[PDB]
Design a protein around this ligand. Sequence first.
Ligand code: APC
Ligand code: MG
Ligand code: ZN
Ligand code: ZN
Ligand code: ZN
Lengths: 263, 97, 84, 533, 204, 61, 66, 51, 113, 133, 137
Amino acid sequence: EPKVNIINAQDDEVELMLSDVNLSLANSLRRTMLAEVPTLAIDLVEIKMNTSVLADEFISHRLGLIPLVSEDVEEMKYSRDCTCEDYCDECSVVLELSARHEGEEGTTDVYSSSLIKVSGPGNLNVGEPVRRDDYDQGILLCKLRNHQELNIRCIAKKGIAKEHAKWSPCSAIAFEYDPHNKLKHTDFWFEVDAKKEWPDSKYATWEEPPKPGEVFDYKAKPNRFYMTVETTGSLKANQVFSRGIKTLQEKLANVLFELENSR
Amino acid sequence: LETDGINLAEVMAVPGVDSSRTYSNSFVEILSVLGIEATRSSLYKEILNVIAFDGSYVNYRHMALLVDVMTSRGYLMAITRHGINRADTGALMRCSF
Amino acid sequence: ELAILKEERTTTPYLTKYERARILGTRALQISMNAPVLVDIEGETDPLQIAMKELSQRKIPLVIRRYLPDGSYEDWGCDELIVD
Amino acid sequence: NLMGKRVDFSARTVISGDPNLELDQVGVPISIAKTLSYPETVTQYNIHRLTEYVRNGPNEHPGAKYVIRDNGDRIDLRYHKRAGDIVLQYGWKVERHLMDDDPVLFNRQPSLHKMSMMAHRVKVMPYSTFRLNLSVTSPYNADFDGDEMNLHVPQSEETRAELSQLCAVPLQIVSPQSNKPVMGIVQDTLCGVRKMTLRDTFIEYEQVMNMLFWVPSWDGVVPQPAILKPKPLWTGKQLLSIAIPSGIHLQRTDGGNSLLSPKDNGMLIVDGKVMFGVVDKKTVGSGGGGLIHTVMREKGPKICAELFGNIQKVVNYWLLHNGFSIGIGDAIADASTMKEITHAISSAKEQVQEIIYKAQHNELELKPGMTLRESFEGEVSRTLNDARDSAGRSAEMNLKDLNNVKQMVSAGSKGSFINIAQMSACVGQQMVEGKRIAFGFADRSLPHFTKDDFSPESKGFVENSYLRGLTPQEFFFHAMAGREGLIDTAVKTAETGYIQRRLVKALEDIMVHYDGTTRNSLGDIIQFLYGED
Amino acid sequence: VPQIGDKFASRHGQKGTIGVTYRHEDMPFSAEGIVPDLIINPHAIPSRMTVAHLIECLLSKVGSIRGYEGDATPFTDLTVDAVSNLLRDNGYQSRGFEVMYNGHTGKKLMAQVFFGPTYYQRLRHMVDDKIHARARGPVQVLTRQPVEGRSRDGGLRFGEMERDCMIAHGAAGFLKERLMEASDAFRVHVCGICGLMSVIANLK
Amino acid sequence: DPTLNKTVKIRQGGYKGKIGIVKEANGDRFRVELHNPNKTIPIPCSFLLIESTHGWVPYED
Amino acid sequence: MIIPVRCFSCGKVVGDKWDAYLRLLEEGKQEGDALDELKLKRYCCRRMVLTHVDLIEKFLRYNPLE
Amino acid sequence: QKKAMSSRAGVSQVLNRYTYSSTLSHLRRTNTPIGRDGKLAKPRQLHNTHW
Amino acid sequence: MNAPDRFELFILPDDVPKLKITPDSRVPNCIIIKFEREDHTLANLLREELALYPDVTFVAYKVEHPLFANFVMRLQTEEGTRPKQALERACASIINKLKTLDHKFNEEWNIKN
Amino acid sequence: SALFDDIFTVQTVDNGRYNKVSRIIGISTTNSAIKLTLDINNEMFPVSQDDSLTVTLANSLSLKSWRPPKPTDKSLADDYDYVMFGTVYKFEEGDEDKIKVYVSFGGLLMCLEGGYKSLASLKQDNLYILIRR
Amino acid sequence: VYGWSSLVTSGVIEYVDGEEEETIMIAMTPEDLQTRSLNDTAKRIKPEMSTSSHHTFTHCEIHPSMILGVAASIIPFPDHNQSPRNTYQSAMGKQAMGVFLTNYNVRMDTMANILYYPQKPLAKTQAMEYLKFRELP
RNA sequence: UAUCGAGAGGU
Ligand SMILES: Nc1ncnc2c1ncn2[C@@H]1O[C@H](COP(=O)(O)CP(=O)(O)OP(=O)(O)O)[C@@H](O)[C@H]1O
Ligand SMILES: [Mg+2]
Ligand SMILES: [Zn+2]
Ligand SMILES: [Zn+2]
Ligand SMILES: [Zn+2]
């Protein structure tokens, strides 16, 4: 009975209409994609040298925000559930960065592309700093001047955005329904005329406006939910939507298990 | 009639004036002309007028208690050291003020 | 001399809010020091709770000595003072 | 050092509001609850509980800091490495951490009256602020813009009982100051309860179920909807009534309304159920004879304290899912009303010209007791203040029911007529020392005017609204009046503070005695019977 | 890092402390999926009459859409209606409102929300620089009463007005305890004849 | 006790992989002063690795 | 201080667009159009780049202290 | 130094550096040395000639 | 300083059950389920699903305090059905709807390739 | 099986105040001096002026905790379009034969005027009102 | 060089103190130097100035926003606020974290606060250019 | 874990 219509698609955003589901299911899917879909992200920074003008934890905070390839992260374990001491090769990716400015002139800009993967759970596709193109330097991290050096060792771990927003695969998620307000779920503020003063939905042409005679259908419920899922590149937009569905399922499955064990 | 300035005794005597109702907003003058029980009522009236002006309301017993303290000695005890500390209260109590 | 006879007592036959708070607290303290309790102790074992149970049954073994301004006094037992 | 002093077992931090705390609770940061302590005597009934606290130690909650022997020797649990090998003896004391439902005295300065110090039940909570139910902000005069408040921990069974049995928040709901409550429904909950109890507010079943479950005292019986067919719908008045205890009757008439209440004003409550009437500040505020006053007299302080929480939990839920806002739009009157406003101010400026003409041609009536110039300034002031009130009334009437400023004014939760007037129509005449702006330059108010100019604009009439914006002259004149307000607040606070101290010292020893008399420390009769009744 | 209790203010005398934080998905959101950094309360506005705060929000919305810093100099020809005209030409309702959705349920809010950028200030007042509690601790040599100040493990002053409050409550035991056991209680010996503290007392 | 003030790594729990210093080791339950945020946490001594001459050694140092 | 990695409000990466934004301004584009070309559609994201101030350029002038 | 009383206090102050705006204001501040004893209001008012 | 570990939102302590069911004896056939380390995400999803069942007579949930990641749900079913069973059915019902939803997205995705 | 029954002609329909409620006044087609003032939900049961409306007042729908109605059971409301349940808060036994019955349907108000013989059964604690057409 | 003092010594700008200000007539803006022909319900009303038939202006304000000092110059639209709110911000603005100097790393001050990511405000005033507020926000 | 002052601030 659930129906899907992909309006547009690309690597980092999918626009789609979702229908024949409950509002609560579309919303719980929205929340799950924002908050609980795992990704990989730097979570421990070993600073061996930092003579830049930036503070150690200033830099560490930016490092955590660098999006890393998280495609195979589902097969990867959480550090808190791994039997090893400290971190290891089965529950983390290790990245290293080393920058320096040689020369008495100019400024060296340190980019996320200088982050070099050193180990990781082979041969899983996880841990590479996301790149737009092949010529893409990525995210600016720091800047160096004569004799200033940056030498760090980073431990990346699997996590979810409930713990820290850096583990979210999304940015915004656009989300709306009932573009003509037939359900009367909002009551518009106006000075002179509400219809002239409020802009049209970008999905106004996807449903038909109410006819001037039409009586109020007090039995209609929301049923068509237009949403666009943007991502940071740690996961592709179709992956976030798919794993969102998967994650919400396991959460319900675990509840069902616990009920069938309380017997 | 209402006046600027007071002379309660002389105005009371003026033929035509209801000598049983003439009032002054100086309760010090009321005490000299009409006595301490009239001063008690006048003191309450003048305080109430202050409180009631900005629409406020204070229960009678609080203002009644204050005006009874100010008149219990038979003269007007100011709410200052010159009134309060002229009491036969202990020295430790009086020196804490 | 100073004591006022039971038949000539004129003060209120109700326990005052101040007498109640002091009686409950004082009795609570005595209970936590293992004073004999005059009611059954079930599940509620805090000293204040036991003291409140004794109060509700008129079983707190204390007397209010109410001083009058002249120094004379009426002794009232908490068994005889009316509790709301 | 003697009438007041610094004390142990005290604490202070920034305050925050919490919609999910009972009226008589205070949320206490964990770190504070681990620093403060209460010395509990060890008995057969608590020795197991208290040994557990001792094992947890001073740094883990619920824990303990000291063990006190009958001799008085304290055992410091920070430095005892064999804390598990401590055996408590009856009669010892354990200085345990502060814990849930411990009574504590809570206080915001300045402590102007007795409900500036009330006893709350501790609730230990994360984060570093003290949490208050919003309905106790009024007696404390507290808000959350940086205010801090103080907490004091009683140290014995006797002083705990004085707090819980005399000073506790619910005992303080009605104050002897004006024989009326000092706490009511405020802010979000008051704004929301008007919106929720509007005659055309309807709630579908699925939301009704959540709202019912949010009332802790709900009896579990879903009431029949006001509309059964074609769709089950409950009204806002029905769900608010869940929060009102049974046996509560209240009647109020607004503007001679009938029992048919066409305007949905007045108030009628029967057996704790709202028959008609928008529920607003006139019903759930702190006024005498309202709902809170009535439940207190009829049900006592415990039920009345739950009333705040019940009302809050239903309304705040409904408002969370309804929404409410305010924007720049709500200050904007339509072009027709602005033209009335601008015309009426223009004609008031003309009347001021006529008054200037009469006074300057010796044709002005002198008021008794007043010089010519006093009479002139008085007539000019009445004209200009009536112009502002008249322009505000036009702006007020033009605002729709949906106008967000109007909704807050109508709930009684924030704002008043003058705020609509000054934001939308006209700020009006600026006063300093009871008079229009004085000629601080020689025969003029600013070097931008000619001498001997008594017009509205010359002596501080601000014609524009805050929406339109003030001119440079108006700006300065408005800042002159505004400075005077800051000066008054800074000065007269010490004037009244000294007054209150002298009042307290005059009266501090005056007590009601067991013979009914009111006497001082000398036994002098001040009143033969308190309040004469 | 900002937390509950820290203080913030716009440039219009409109100040507040953080009451709670909500994650991205619990915030209200617009159809475009924009969520606020910060939600202040409508009751802060009508009695304070800080209309500049509202106008600043409107102009700043326009400015970030069109790519410039709006001119908010006082005493210019700029009007609210002119800024509203620009905003409407950019696809938003002209007075700054937006339809928004409750984060818990996904349902629209019955009310539209004034929404847009406003310049906010991080003030020096942070709760963890103020929080303080004292059980026991150091006293003054001369009075043996607790020392003054957070920075010295001090105790709060129970001043004369707090004394008066406890008198009004009739809490005689509590007031005695505050001012003795919780402060400078001391045992002295006096002579029953002359009443002076001239007694020489060897207790062992 | 011989492990106070000595540097430590945590091998179990929510703080796994984090550096710290033994601030107080009364018995069985230690207090490690984490490096990363300004907080000293309670942790069992079983959860710690101590630094010694050769690498991180469990509580056999 | 230096361009933030993410938009505070929505999380979209903007730390890889600072050089491209300065370049579009050298090429004579107006700020609004440059933001448009960079695909910064939500006004939360536009604020991030439009109002950032690059202070690290000032801090670098202070001759390194090692 | 020997006349620390009767001398005026607060003429020199530690330069406020909390933020850049606060430094600019501190360098442009003025003081009226009237006191705090004797309330009045007249020197505290915003006088017309302050424009 | 008094901030809790963020992992406490979703990691269940070992002595703390994900789920605890008790009766509400004030009405017949009603249970209270306390969910630990869960959100509106789970609670609102279960709630609507359950409310549309014909044999569910009451369903509601509340997050009693936003600073603590738990919620409590109240569920009553008609005499025929047992409340805990209806909850089990809602779980399996929603898991199925999401399986369908995952399939139809996969198909629609290849179609758009 | 009902307590009161009649047909009313709508004389006035006041919207004004609310977007979802209107107050209507009607007079019995069969008996003048029997007047009905009633608040109703615009969106659920839209009425216009001069509409003919059958109004029934019952104390039971039978031919304590509310539940969504089962499709199998059957009640008096199956034959009407719009049903409300309310509280009788005033039974006015006035002079001559001017009798008023005031009912609150969750704040949607009704006053029914008429004679004792037409309204004596309405002296109830609660009333349903059922409206047809 | 031809700068500010060139205007002062060429008779187009002069300095006046409080005493000399007593004897001059100042127009608020250049437009007030000449009489006009409006009725735009959005913009603010200008005083009529109908007490003198003909005004003889001696000077004109350069800009009226220069009556403000450093702190109040940070307020956007102070002409739309109740005047005490402008006083309150003038205090709080001095309590707002930013970047107090660019050399904070080489100063060892008793206390210093630096906002991680300062932004310049979307709503600014002309006077902020001279305060450097957009450069050290 | 000092004392006496001063200055700037918070509600
Ligand atoms: N100098 C002072 N002396 C004594 N008490 C003061 C004080 N300054 C502030 N207070 C206390 O703090 C209160 C001031 O509250 P504010 O937050 O300053 C204004 P308000 O009247 O509550 O709100 P507003 O900002 O909406 O006008 C006083 O009523 C008093 O309780
Ligand atoms: Mg305040
Ligand atoms: Zn591992
Ligand atoms: Zn002697
Ligand atoms: Zn963004």
